[PDB]
């Protein structure tokens, strides 16, 4: 279909991968560090979950470099992804509505 | 690293009795404990995880409570296979760490 | 009127049905879990307002499977509906500077 | 100038105001209710700011019902103002565009 | 190339300064303000990266009225950066679209 | 301010021993402690950081753990050479501050 739409699933498939690479990337960065939270899976991709949407309650974070390096990307991938939705709505809005004019 | 306590060290109790096993934890770690049984010569045996949640296989007996910083493993109407030691194991900061241990006598 | 609007007001009473519904919800899934503080309606429906804007005090949040899906579909909900809030104006913006010019 | 523009300026100059008048609110709205933080002027418009941004640290919130309707106000009029500068800057963009095709 | 693009580019270019001089920045005016943790280097780039994409986890935040500035400066950049993203790629989505059609 | 709790002032250690210092913080303040060797008539040295980064041109013989509240400097076999006072210090929180210190005797 349209280029935006292609766009936007597009950026979606990519921020659901990037949810469960940051998650388990994350474990990975984060044990060994002793204090660390951000230590088991389950919880790790709830943590990227609300760190992509930019709500980030505070319960969970990392605290070492490369896990603070996941973060970014995962906070990237969903604001991305976002901006993305948003720009192919107004896509469609738009041009739809040069026909009702 | 999070300290966790198990006192008493030893515990003694009449057959079929209500027994609980204390684990107190240096700081709070919500339900992020688990408890281990471990018989003379055994290797450890999970027995509840998370606090409170049940693992298949083990009796209906055996239940855990707790949050925070206090645990407790209770076991209603303790018999004679239930003799050996406990043990908590954390893992809501790293690194794991696991309690001294309670040893259940009848 | 325009599909946009008629999106973006869509999507407006949806989100307010998801905050209600996001709010009892949350309670239902909280309650059973020791150490859980989402577990009475008035503030669970304050933390579904600061998790649909996206901006998460850390004063609340769901410590359970459920009470976190919950959570997934109150941040899609409100960051949806905002970026067609968004898509809707750039439409209006666009289609009434055609004018202008 | 065009629509947009006033849109967006009038919708900066409309979020200064409900930063005064949420700062000046809360600490009305949080005085009485024992525990309470978002008591004092200048820290009570840093969290305005940061709740207007919806980046909030949670150094700081409203308990009370009052304070918390109020914190809402502050969420929507700076979403609502960020979403028309990105708008307005779409119009701005995509009216440009027409010309350099 | 279209002023949109020239428009995204320029901010990212000019966040990255921001990120830094904010980073730098922050340091240099919380030190002196006792009980404040935003106060070496590596960590206060962390915490401006979080401030700019507005998930703010609360690890780490300005207490000084300097150290508050900063911060609003930062989230201003960032927000505004990525708001210029999303209007660039509206653009390119409806230019483009103009042509499938 | 934070306050570094270094106790006891003074260790005896039987020479290759195994010794450990201890450094209690006040509040928690993650691993943002550092560890300092100063022999007499000499200036501090940075023997540890981040209660458990290794510096080079520092002895293997040194390490250091914790995290909250509780730090420790271990020393592997202890030898003549690490007679001297040992501080810690926090950079967690401003301002930063050091243990009152611990002087290691053989
Ligand atoms: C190696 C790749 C790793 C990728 C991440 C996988 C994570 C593990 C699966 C998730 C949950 C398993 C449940 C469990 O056994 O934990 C529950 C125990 O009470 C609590 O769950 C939790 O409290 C975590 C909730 C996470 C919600 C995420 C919602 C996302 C839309
Ligand atoms: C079953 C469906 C449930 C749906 C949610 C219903 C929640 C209950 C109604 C809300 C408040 C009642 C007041 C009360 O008795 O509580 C106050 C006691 O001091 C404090 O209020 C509070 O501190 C909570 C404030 C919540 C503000 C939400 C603002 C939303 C725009
Ligand atoms: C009745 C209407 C009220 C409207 C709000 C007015 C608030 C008071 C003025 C603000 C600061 C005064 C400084 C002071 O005496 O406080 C400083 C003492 O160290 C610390 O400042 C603080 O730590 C608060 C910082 C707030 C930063 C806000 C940045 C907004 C872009
Ligand atoms: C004067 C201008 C200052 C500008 C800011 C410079 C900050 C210093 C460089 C950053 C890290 C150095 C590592 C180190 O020695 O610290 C690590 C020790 O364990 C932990 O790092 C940390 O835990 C901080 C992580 C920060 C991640 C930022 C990611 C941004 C995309
Ligand atoms: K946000
Ligand atoms: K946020
Ligand atoms: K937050
Ligand atoms: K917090
Ligand atoms: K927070």
């Given at each position: 279909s349209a280029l935006h739409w292609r766009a936007a699933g597009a950026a979606t498939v990519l921020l659901v991968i990037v949810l469960l690479?940051?998650?388990?990337?994350?474990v990975l960065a984060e044990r060994g560090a002793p204090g660390a939270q951000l230590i088991t899976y389950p919880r790790a991709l709830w943590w990227a979950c609300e760190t992509a949407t930019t709500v980030x309650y505070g319960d969970l974070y990392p605290?070492?470099?490369?896990?603070?390096?996941?973060?970014?990307?995962?906070?990237?991938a969903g604001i991305t992804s976002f901006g993305l939705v948003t720009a192919a709505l107004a896509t469609w809005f738009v041009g739809r509505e040069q026909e009702r004019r | 690293?999070?300290?966790?306590?198990?006192?008493?060290?030893?515990?003694?109790?009449?057959?079929?009795?209500?027994?609980?096993?204390?684990?107190?934890?240096?700081?709070?770690?919500?339900?992020?404990?688990?408890?281990?049984?471990?018989?003379?010569?055994?290797?450890?045996?999970?027995?509840?995880?998370?606090?409170?949640?049940?693992?298949?296989?083990?009796?209906?007996?055996?239940?855990?409570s707790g949050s925070g910083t206090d645990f407790t493993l209770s076991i209603n109407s303790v018999?004679?296979?239930?003799?050996?030691?406990?043990?908590?194991?954390?893992?809501?900061?790293?690194?794991?760490?696991?309690?001294?241990?309670?040893?259940?006598?009848?």
């Open positions: 690479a940051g998650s388990y990337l994350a605290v070492t470099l490369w896990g603070r390096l996941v973060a970014v990307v995962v906070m990237v | 690293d999070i300290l966790l306590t198990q006192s008493p060290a030893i515990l003694s109790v009449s057959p079929g009795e209500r027994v609980s096993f204390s684990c107190r934890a240096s700081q709070s770690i919500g339900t992020d404990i688990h408890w281990y049984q471990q018989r003379t010569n055994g290797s450890p045996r999970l027995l509840i995880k998370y606090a409170s949640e049940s693992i298949s296989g083990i009796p209906s007996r055996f239940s855990g018999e004679s296979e239930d003799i050996a030691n406990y043990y908590c194991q954390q893992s809501n900061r790293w690194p794991f760490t696991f309690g001294s241990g309670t040893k259940l006598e009848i």
